[PDB]
Amino acid sequence: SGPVPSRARVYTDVNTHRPREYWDYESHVVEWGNQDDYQLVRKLGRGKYSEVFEAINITNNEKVVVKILKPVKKKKIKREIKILENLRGGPNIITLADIVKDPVSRTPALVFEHVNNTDFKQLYQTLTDYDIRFYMYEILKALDYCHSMGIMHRDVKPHNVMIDHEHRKLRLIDWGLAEFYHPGQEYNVRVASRYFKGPELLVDYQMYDYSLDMWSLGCMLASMIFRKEPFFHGHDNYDQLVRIAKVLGTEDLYDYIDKYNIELDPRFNDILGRHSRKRWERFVHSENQHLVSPEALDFLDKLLRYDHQSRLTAREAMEHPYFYTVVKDQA
Numbered sequence: 295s296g297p298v299p300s301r302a303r304v305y306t307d308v309n310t311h312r313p314r315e316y317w318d319y320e321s322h323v324v325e326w327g328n329q330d331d332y333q334l335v336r337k338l339g340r341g342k343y344s345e346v347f348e349a350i351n352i353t354n355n356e357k358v359v360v361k362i363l364k365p366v367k368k369k370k371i372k373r374e375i376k377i378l379e380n381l382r383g384g385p386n387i388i389t390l391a392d393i394v395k396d397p398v399s400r401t402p403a404l405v406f407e408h409v410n411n412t413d414f415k416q417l418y419q420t421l422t423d424y425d426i427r428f429y430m431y432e433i434l435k436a437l438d439y440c441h442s443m444g445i446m447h448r449d450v451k452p453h454n455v456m457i458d459h460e461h462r463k464l465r466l467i468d469w470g471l472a473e474f475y476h477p478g479q480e481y482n483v484r485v486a487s488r489y490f491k492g493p494e495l496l497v498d499y500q501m502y503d504y505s506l507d508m509w510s511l512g513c514m515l516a517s518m519i520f521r522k523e524p525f526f527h528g529h530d531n532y533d534q535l536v537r538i539a540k541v542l543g544t545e546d547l548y549d550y551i552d553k554y555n556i557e558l559d560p561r562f563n564d565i566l567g568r569h570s571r572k573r574w575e576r577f578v579h580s581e582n583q584h585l586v587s588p589e590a591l592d593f594l595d596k597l598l599r600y601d602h603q604s605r606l607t608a609r610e611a612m613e614h615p616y617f618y619t620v621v622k623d624q625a
């Protein structure tokens with residue numbers, strides 16, 4: 295009979311009330327700078343979607359980050375460029391300084407502000423319980439801003455949180471998968487990294503919204519406070535839902551399926567089984583108790599929900615008791 299429709303419950307119509315140029319990135323006109331403004335210094339890593347380099351702007355001798363874009367539809371490039379341009383100056387959003395194209399190889403490249411190459415996956419065992427709360431809050435700042443701007447990130451994971459610990463600086467990067475949210479649009483589900491893929495993606499429910507970023511945040515939170523990385527470690531996209539179900543239980547999984555009238559892959563028919571919902575206490579142990587509290591546990595539970603609509607929004611998360619002393623200290 296077809297899936298049941300769904301609307302985001304915050305920032306639902308933000309993009310409708312913008313000029314078309316705001317979200318119609320397909321017609322955006324890129325103005326290209328000169329790639330001879332920059333000399334590449336060293337490779338910073340990454341693959342698949344790009345190759346990232348540290349680079350010097352010869353004009354001001356200031357360090358810069360250059361993402362050579364790997365061949366993909368021109369519109370996906372315009373999309374990322376326009377989302378970046380739209381989010382420029384947002385709290386903890388990476389800042390685009392320029393766009394250039396190889397003189398010969400016509401390959402486009404994005405030039406970014408520099409931040410000290412340390413992302414969130416490393417920096418791990420050095421994080422205290424207050425550090426987790428402070429960096430989680432900083433990520434929520436960036437998530438709530440882009441959401442309020444009609445944009446969902448869709449690849450939230452530790453490799454995409456850059457941090458300068460010495461200055462408590464954090465930047466949400468990689469906007470290459472980000473989309474504008476439009477009420478009633480059916481989105482591609484092959485986004486995100488497996489361990490951070492929301493259930494909606496795994497059961498092919500396409501009318502999803504910002505709350506997908508909140509699931510992915512929940513996955514990060516869990517692996518940190520429990521010191522199990524990743525927390526849902528599935529061997530593929532299908533087994534990734536089974537891992538989730540072994541923890542959230544199958545009762546709620548199937549109520550979600552029913553509520554939105556989702557037709558499940560006949561596959562899953564044989565692998566999901568019956569699984570109670572576990573109490574978070576079962577993942578607590580002596581090496582991570584110092585990171586677990588009633589506050590963290592309450593907050594985590596409120597992010598990891600099958601039903602994308604019962605997950606906390608960014609702004610609700612930011613008001614959770616979990617963040618009280620970071621909210622206090624920051625003022």
Ligand SMILES: O=C(O)Cc1c[nH]c2cc(Cl)ccc12
Pocket residue numbers: 329330332333334349360362394396403404405
């Ligand atoms: O070494 C290269 O690939 C050529 C090249 C020199 N400087 C650049 C700056 C950008 Cl942004 C992109 C490509 C280049």
Ligand SMILES: O=C(O)Cc1c[nH]c2cc(Cl)ccc12
Pocket residue numbers: 338340346359361388406407408409410411456467468469470
């Ligand atoms: O923006 C992106 O998607 C590319 C990227 C990968 N690693 C980085 C580190 C910094 Cl500091 C700035 C930007 C990047």
